[PDB]
């Protein structure tokens, strides 16, 4: 009986092994930066 149980655990090990095997543009940017840089320096100042 004990051997049988151990065998069940072995089946569990196999299943786990299988599971683990399974588991293991440009203008838009230029315009956007143009704004960003402008607003960030606050150079306007007029």
């Amino acid at each position: 009986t004990m051997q049988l149980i151990k065998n069940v655990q072995d089946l569990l090990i196999l299943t786990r092994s299988i599971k683990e095997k399974w588991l293991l543009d440009e203008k838009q940017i230029e315009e956007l930066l143009d704004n960003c840089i402008e607003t960030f320096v606050a150079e306007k100042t007029t």
Partner: protein, 139 residues
């Protein structure tokens, strides 16, 4: 085979010696009244020469398979036809020793060993925790 008969007082009314050891064999529960010795005794009422007398009679026999005085002797229960035995009793320390097998003593051994084997097996078997990825671990 499991028991030990002693009539420590029986030594006191006599003293414990060879012919005495025979008679004391007769006193203990291990003795049988179905033997020839009882017949001879009863006939007498109504040690070599004894052995000489057993040669004439036909039946179960008990003879002297040792002398170590004043302690040990074997007393052999044998079935005479050529002499077949039966069992062998030892007399040591004013106590009748049961003649326990061969097979029975071995039985005792096996039994004991097996029993505690079982105990250990269960006790330890309760302990482990099993996870499929972890296998069997002891917490």
């Amino acid at each position: 085979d499991e028991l030990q008969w002693k009539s420590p007082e029986w030594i006191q009314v006599f003293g414990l010696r060879t012919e005495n050891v025979l008679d004391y064999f007769a006193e203990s529960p291990f003795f049988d009244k179905t033997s020839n010795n009882q017949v001879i005794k009863m006939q007498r009422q109504f040690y070599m020469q004894l052995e000489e007398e057993l040669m004439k009679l036909d039946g179960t026999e008990y003879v002297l398979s040792s002398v170590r005085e004043p302690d040990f002797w074997v007393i052999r229960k044998q079935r005479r036809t050529e002499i077949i035995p039966l069992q062998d009793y030892y007399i040591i320390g004013a106590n009748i020793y049961q003649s326990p097998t061969i097979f029975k003593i071995v039985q005792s051994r096996l039994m004991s060993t097996s029993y505690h084997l079982n105990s250990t097996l269960e006790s330890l078997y309760d302990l482990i925790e099993f996870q499929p990825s972890q296998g069997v671990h002891y917490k």
